[PDB]
Design a protein around this ligand. Sequence first.
Ligand SMILES: NS(=O)(=O)c1c(F)c(F)c(SCCc2ccccc2)c(F)c1NCc1ccccc1
Ligand SMILES: [Zn+2]
Length: 257
Amino acid sequence: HWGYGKHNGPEHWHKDFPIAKGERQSPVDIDTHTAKYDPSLKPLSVSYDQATSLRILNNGHAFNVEFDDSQDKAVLKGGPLDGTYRLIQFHFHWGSLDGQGSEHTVDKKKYAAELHLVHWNTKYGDFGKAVQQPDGLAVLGIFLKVGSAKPGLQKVVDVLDSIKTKGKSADFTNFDPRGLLPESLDYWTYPGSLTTPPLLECVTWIVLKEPISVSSEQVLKFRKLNFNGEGEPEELMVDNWRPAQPLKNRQIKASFK
Ligand SMILES: NS(=O)(=O)c1c(F)c(F)c(SCCc2ccccc2)c(F)c1NCc1ccccc1
Ligand SMILES: [Zn+2]
């Protein structure tokens, strides 16, 4: 029932998911002048050499590239995190137009899209248990702007026609998520939530400062996906982002400068 459309979009979510109006909701506007450099933060450690991608799924809201997380193979640690977070899936949010699409904003600036690499804290044993904990997830957020193509994204763009509609999936092995990272790992971090229902307040957000560039042709292919299932009227999958939510009693910390 929840979605992005005219009648079931983010402004409606609170009726099924009252935590929508909670104290640590995401995304947020990153006010770069008020984020405080925190010299006690660590460099982030992104270890994806052993990543095992399995499958790509259109779930009717976005597409997820799913990983094998039954062993320590693709982990995020360091930075603001204690302990070890496994990679479980990544997905994107994007706009109908290049001027919008990202969920976090930077001094109110919207990017064309935003990548979310989702990881769960191994101390809780699995994803379903982790999301019930305030430190259960670490999401690495990366902005996309339109300019030169991102070679490491092409294998993703090229399988999308095979998962056009809701519920379709395709084998997606041997995908290396290192090809989606920018050069710098400088980041902002704050405590937040999943940006989709159930909107659980279980996420340490780590949002990279440096955006990656993707081509206009790459993002156009994202916008040919469908929210609807096969043999339903076409509703293009665009504008699947939640707008910035109030920061409330939170501090965003910078790893740099
Ligand atoms: N967008 S996000 O990075 O904050 C995110 C996340 F961190 C997750 F762990 C997950 S999986 C957690 C979902 C869940 C469902 C039922 C019960 C418990 C938990 C996300 F789906 C998304 N959302 C993905 C998405 C994007 C666009 C449309 C629909 C879903
Ligand atoms: Zn997301």
